[PDB]
Symmetry: C2
Subunit: 108 residues, 2 copies
């Protein structure tokens, strides 16, 4: 049976593929594909990015390290890593200790 | 609403926490916690690891880079990165092109 740790790893690759096969090379993200994925799959984690196209342009040029105007699976995971670490930090920030009660914000 | 890219990032941190808070430091994985997580959450991705304790010992000592006998969230993600990249490779291997039909193996 697939554990929830296994589904999360699969869903990440499944979601990258859902946007990489749309145009151009089927295993890389064009600008249109990456903006489409970001606006549709990272709308809460990147609430300021979806509406501010000026930010997606900065992110695309930082992730595209080999400067071929598309994001390989390796280049796109660099963002997924930064999100996981940032979500882990915020999750500890939204859950302070010593209050004597739970918090249910998660990360944003 | 939480996209499936957002749930996967949350479930990864939620699963690491489910095993890190059991004993010792609540944000790190002891040996018992990491073996417990691996055997319960990576049973298919690491089918040879769950039954072969000799492998979990190698993995624990490679992930524990600062040699304090526990895995921080940063040290444990190094494994999660290798799994994602290995699952992405195997997913292309299990889905050859040109057969004229789909494949449903995913990755193992
Ligand atoms: Ca593409
Ligand atoms: Ca590139
Ligand atoms: Ca612990
Ligand atoms: Ca350590
Ligand atoms: Na690739
Ligand atoms: Na930490
Ligand atoms: Zn791929
Ligand atoms: Zn409180
Ligand atoms: Zn934590
Ligand atoms: Zn076939």
């Amino acid at each position: 049976a697939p554990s929830q740790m296994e589904r999360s790893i699969t869903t990440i690759i499944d979601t990258f593929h859902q946007y990489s096969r749309k145009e151009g090379h089927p295993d890389t993200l064009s600008k249109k594909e990456f903006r489409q994925m970001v606006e549709a799959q990272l709308a809460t984690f990147m609430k300021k990015e979806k509406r501010n196209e000026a930010l997606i342009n900065d992110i695309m040029e930082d992730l595209d390290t080999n400067q071929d105007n598309q994001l390989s699976f390796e280049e796109a995971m660099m963002l997924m890593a930064k999100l996981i670490f940032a979500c882990h930090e915020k999750l500890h920030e939204n859950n302070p200790r010593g209050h004597g009660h739970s918090h249910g914000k998660g990360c944003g």
